[model samples]
Target: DSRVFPTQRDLMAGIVSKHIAKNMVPSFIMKAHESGIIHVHDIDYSPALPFTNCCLVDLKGMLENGFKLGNAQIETPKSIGVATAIMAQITAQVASHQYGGTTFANVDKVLSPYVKRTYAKHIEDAEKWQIADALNYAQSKTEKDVYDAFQAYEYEVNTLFSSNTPFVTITFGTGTDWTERMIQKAILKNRIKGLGRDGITPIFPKLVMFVEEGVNLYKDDPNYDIKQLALECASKRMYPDIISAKNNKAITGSSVPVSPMGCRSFLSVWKDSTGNEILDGRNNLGVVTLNLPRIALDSYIGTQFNEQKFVELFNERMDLCFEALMCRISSLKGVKATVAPILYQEGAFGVRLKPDDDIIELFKNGRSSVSLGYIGIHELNILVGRDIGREILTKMNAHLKQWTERTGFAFSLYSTPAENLCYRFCKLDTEKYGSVKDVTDKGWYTNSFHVSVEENITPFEKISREAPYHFIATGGHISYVELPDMKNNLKGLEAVWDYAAQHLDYFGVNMPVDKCFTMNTIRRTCAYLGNPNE
Candidate 1:
């Protein structure tokens, strides 16, 4: 209860949010939501109030050119320590203003300058003391400072709870400079070391490392050592989830590798006046996820699957989803920049607007995306008894593309990360249809297009089967392989990574991490779906 409804603020906020949802939401949308036909995500935040879902924070822009935090006039950080400290503050501020994940796009590149600044200071101190090993002294001191700063940053991020630890993500591994590499090394090392006396995994600040072919994938690559370190980190921490620069670029059509905004919601390619693809300071406006299995079940009549009826029902549900998504966009239409100054008036979204300026334009011109999310794709196919997953996704994607062109808004198809909806939808469907075999028999619906956890398949097969969905679910998607302890199987992990880099855009490796409360130690074993504490 504390985690879900943490504080007095949350208790009050929930009351107000529900009141608004009941009175203000479109009746049809509210009905659909009540019936579990679709889920209007973050309704507690958006439609009730003007709030965007997730963002890839423009940390570099904000830190490079000074920004204001509250009444304090903050300037650009002059050292790695100050930069990392400011980075935590920015993450907290940005998280409070949005409903979903907050990403510090590329921490390695963002902190590289400050790392150099710290190094410069060390060199100056070495010169002042007339040290014989000036070069070595400066290098070692700078690296140590970077490591300490990141270690402190890790602790700060883990402890700072804004409605539950502020779902933060930091991306890295692209920068090639020594300072940048130091930044990468420091963060990864801190993550592997874990936190507190028990060395329990720190769940905040998810790490995403960029993987490129000639940059870090091959042994001959310049940043290959960093990739090896990342593999070790992933093997231990279940993190540094990789984004293939090559696959991401090809799929998103962005020249540079773009990080996902929060967990998986990705921004579509938007260009500046010079036609350069911009990644940072973009976000998803909101998400309305269709209950895919519900749609399929509704279309099923007695013993036969009605394809024509399914098409008709699917289109009708999509129309409702569109209306729900537009309601979210419209609610944000007249919101002032001052509402979330850190985002609009500061450089979080790469803008500094007047206090009363309308912030709607920021969502225009593909700068931000409005997501059309769907869950239960696998269950939908099962209900229909047909492998129509691709066809269904293709149709959904087509609708998004059509809507994007029609409205000139970045309408993107997303595979909803249905943490709660997976269970909520299943519970409602079970109540309504009374536990149909393979559909509602389980307590939870399949998330997005993923194969059921009960399925026995090779990691490569799972990756290959799920990879195509990543291509179509361009708004946001991730493929994760559940594996046993892989700390001693770096070569095997690397092979999977290699295959995923070629086939998928975003990938995560899940391994068991157990902690002993009394001994303050972590143990790895076979993966378990139940509570690790037990």
Candidate 2:
């Protein structure tokens, strides 16, 4: 009876059929995974110890005679490798002993041989070791003891994290008793997949906790799975409605962290991690599966307690959660989309914006704009009643005016539009990113934040790889975006580009290879964009 009524399948075919024609035009998936959003080092962020401290560890320093805080002997954290391993062990143990969370203790015991290797004095020592004897020792306690425990532990850790330990050959050879297998030796023995091919036949073993974490914690939750969300996110004119919405902290002006108590209202956001936002950060299961435990601690009076400031900061955090969720829900309802946080990675946020260098410059040191008041009367009316929208718009305009007045680079009041402009602006899209690993749609950023400052980034592929998308202007100039790796550096840039090229978007559009870097050149051309914040 409805005027536009047609069989649902028929309607669907009509809509989807047209997409095939747009095929050569390439219906690019504007995804967070596609856009490098998954690789954020900081989000809505102004990184600081107060910010980074949430995930910090308090390794009891070796007392002069070597004592630990809880009668637990402190392992010497000399090398970063040892330190990192210690951090992992301690993290799992806290969950095991203190939080009563799932842990790898018994399995950890089997791994002592493997784990202890990280603390070895030299690569030679680690390279020439094995664990067969260790396994034998354990098996005497209970047949194949150490090896079996290791198998079980490795399986759980890998499976839970959706990771793999493809192939391994080593300097020490295969055995179950080695105490110091070197990563260098272990990596060398990793069976190469296709000897002459680019295919991955990795020889080393690495953990995959981050990926499998979702499967372990979020299979039942409809909102957090990226595949499901992608369908919803892409349904509306390629813009998925935000289910767990949040304002771009980069765009929204920030609050001071010093007087955290006064900003208590901002702490309780129901969407972002400050406070209330964490409520939405969970799976349908209310358990916190991630460790975004940022906080400003008064170490003098350690655990089970925090400064009164922390409580107030939590209060403001919840406030922000309310503001963030309200805004997100409003956005979702208006768009009819299902969107939520992806563990809102980095776990959480605090209420107070402590007086740090970053926050201080953001608040008190931004250059005064010449035209905060000179908006057209008509534009003002469109934004009048909405407090959040008005604040966003005003902040944007102020930044825009500042860009024009000071830098001479045309800026916009809106942030995404500005990023899009910058993406294509100065012709970065045409010159630098013109390969298979190139970003065709918006870029997908990974944990490495500064990679945007380097490399010909691309997408993911296979055999532990990713395919990247590429975009090129007629002039043969190119630019692109992609995810960052764990270690944020040039190596990270290379690793990501390698991942994109070998794995995803394999056959990228390759035009004039070298000359296609107009944007990269311009960035160099304008080497002095802005002074680093003092």
Candidate 3:
């Protein structure tokens, strides 16, 4: 409850993170899976200034693909799920940096050491150094070194993965298979051919998340037409499939009354130290990282392995990631499928499924993995403990199936599959996926979010912003506020919300402010907005 630690009552948890895969399985098994699995031993490998152990990437997908390109004998998923996972991880990973290091050639080789240095710089800035300090430091550097550093961290990102490059994937009509098993086979066969000569094990099990749902709805809707919509919002674009507005106005045609501002789900992210506690204070006090939730899990292991032991654990981690994602995240009374991003660095590729789509629980035992003998990518905070993970997964899966069944969103096999997904997308000039950038870059931490029951805030006169679903995504918290005496002005709903934001601007700066729904939150922000005494 305390945002700031008290001088008297210490407000830190002696949380210890242990890697357990070593304890659960044998070393040989790891050799078999390490081709793709990785552990981010340290985000900051630099021995320079303050170091920030920033993040870990999900590498299974890339590894599998790499093995295929090189030589391996494993299969890969054909479903968009694999692409989804990769994009998700890449987007989140690349985005987590102030200036990114994911898209360059030798991305792994570059990032492996570059991140440590950059993160160290970040730490210096956050803990003790200021922009001026950094400026001074840069000024002191020889122009060549400065240019070289910039060159090293340039756009040739995604260098850390086995496949440090972009990939292509497309979807068809309503899918009959939840798991696209054939694509997995092709990749495996290709890997053996690629990696066998090197004396390395064939790397062909392309780690992918394949889900076949809601296709029926797209295909079945006699009146529904996706030709334009799908092509317009296709995956080749900068933000493929990301159609959220502060109030759904992002998608112009939908009959719902329009609203302004973009929207997204956010989360809390924390860094892990060698000893397992969050990386903060005089030696430790730190900022808690936050990201979008419900994103696929492959975004956490892009660079965690070199040897077999760490890689195998990564494999086990992958084998159980989908299940792991559900650890602390469970279905609620009102929420349907939740969303997550790969640390806001992956220029994330995810689908906002129709709430009714079926969901399958994948990583249930990842929580216990904290102490498990494995890698510490992104501090392994989301890594569920295998034992506890299994238990929690059991409950979440039921919700997954139940939620999907309730969706009743049918899939349809198109009479003729629409091709040129990428080509068509090129017209928008957005088809090229945006490079990964840190979520914090967008300032979600300092940002604000809220749900307006009445209508809209920051509304334009031409548009009346109201919706059947929750709208309004702000920088900070996307909390809901109740209607009160402020609703008296029927000039429109958006006005009420504007009234609310102003009302909320200084609502309870002096009180123990909690939620907007709470009486306290309402009294203040509304007061700030000049609402009635009530």
Candidate 4:
């Protein structure tokens, strides 16, 4: 019976739940969706409404100093196994706090040192066996040890965070250092190796590779081995989302070290007092998506487009979102450090504040962000026609910039994924104003600045057009190229990446994760393997 007793972890979790409940605002879910101020993301993150979604945590920083979990000192990582477990546990704990995701920033870079130490330690132990007269055995043992450690790192991360809510989006590659390259190499190899079974890519960690042009793009590039392996891995897994720092480099002198907060949402760079942009120690609190088509629809007067009315409404909605963001920020002020120690108390978010620190000061400047997200570009384009969508969006970007400049708050725009809101917005529009040709006829709206899925456009065209919007949607944006299963044709995948690397900020191939063509195809493969039940 004593063996069945609850652990300290349970008690700690209970306290977190109690405190979160205490601090949350009334009708939290109601305000999140119906407030008209904003369409809040993920109902589970009701406690941190308008403040949920992936906020990059300095996993590297935590492992350096170490921390406590349920009175147990989770030691600073020394080996790959230790490092993987710590990152997994910390991310899982953070997920428990908010319904949104958490990204381990520069995850490969952070884990690199530990991986090197692990490799050397394993190699050194193997030397002892060589002294004992088994040179062959030493080599075998060395290989196994190195393999086991690398495998264990991936294994623990996958197993521990499998059931975690929201998601863990990992950003990798683009490290210039020796240790970084070494770890990234191992990660790519093992990730490609996948599970012993069918080499099926483990879908968790939602890997994002921040690629550089001269680095990962060319076959002759130094990091091309890992880059090619990642491309191959992506062909099978539909993962390691390709984000372009190369595109950034094309414009600016060098690419800002980029990473996405969620699968799609990206945090814009933070600017200091003198207008110098700070790349690191920046992230988004929450996204309030504006229904762009709805605004256009509402402003429709007979056959004529109401430019003044639409612009006024757009500004009105922007201000409303700002008000809602402030409300969300206000709610975060009441959230004590005890609720999520690793995030608020510890400097996980690169906030060098203490447990007793007044957390309100964190959002005062531009350290964190409240994004004004917009969806329905396709519908708006259909309604206004031709260049109207881009023109309106361009002005919206200017307004967002001015808002950011005027107010010290990180008020940026995002071409947000409406997700279920696509349907919800359509339903609301149909009920209120009925269906209008191409606007409300479909049950859903197009995501972000993407052309309609129903539209017949080449993936290259999609990425090219969407690329410009990426700069405008400074908060964060992802443009996905829809493709059938490309596991067979890696050339197509490679070409897609090549173009995306040169054009877009964040791009990914929307390929099928499952490799089998059909149910019969899977059955045949399993039968060929002498395991039909699989």
- Please tell me which predicted candidate would have the highest lDDT against the true structure: 1
**87-193 per-residue lDDT for model 3 (tens digits):** 34443343332111221111222122322343345546554744656645533332223233323221122232233212211112221321212222222222222
- What is candidate 4's CA lDDT for residue 491? 83
TM agreement with the true structure for every prediction: 0.96, 0.21, 0.18, 0.83
lDDT of 1: 0.84
The models' CA-based lDDT, in order, is 0.84, 0.23, 0.23, 0.66
* CA displacement after TM-score superposition, residue 441 of candidate 4 (Å): 1.7
Q: Order the numbered candidates by TM-score, best leading.
A: 1, 4, 2, 3
> Model 3 — which ten-residue stretch has the worst lDDT?
409-418
What TM value does model 3 have? Answer: 0.18
Model 4 clash pairs are 266-476
Q: Candidate 1 lDDT, tens digit per residue, 343-449?
A: 99988988788899999988787888889888877788888887888889899888888888877789888888787788899999888888888888978888888
Candidate 3 Cα outliers beyond 4 Å, as residue runs? 1-143, 155-266, 269-534
Q: What is the C-alpha RMSD of each candidate to the true structure, in Å?
A: 2.4, 23.3, 28.4, 6.5
lDDT of 4 by residue, 1-534 (tens): 123224344445546654563456445434434633247554334443323456777776677776666567777777766676676677667766555567776766777777666666656776764546454544454445445655775665666544323466777787866667765666666776766566555656677887775777788876887777788877766667787776654432323665766666565555566776654444566766777787877787986778788878778776766665555666666555666676666656665666677665666666776678888888887776655656676777787777677766767777776656778777777776787788788777777777777778898998888888877777767778878777778888889988888887777776655445222111111001112343
* Model 4 segments more than 4 A misplaced: 1-38, 47-52, 131-164, 176-179, 193-201, 249-256, 271-281, 302-304, 515-534
Selected candidate, larger TM-score, 3 vs 4: 4
What's the C-alpha lDDT at position 152 in model 2?
Answer: 36
Please report how far candidate 2 places residue 284 from its true position, in Å: 22
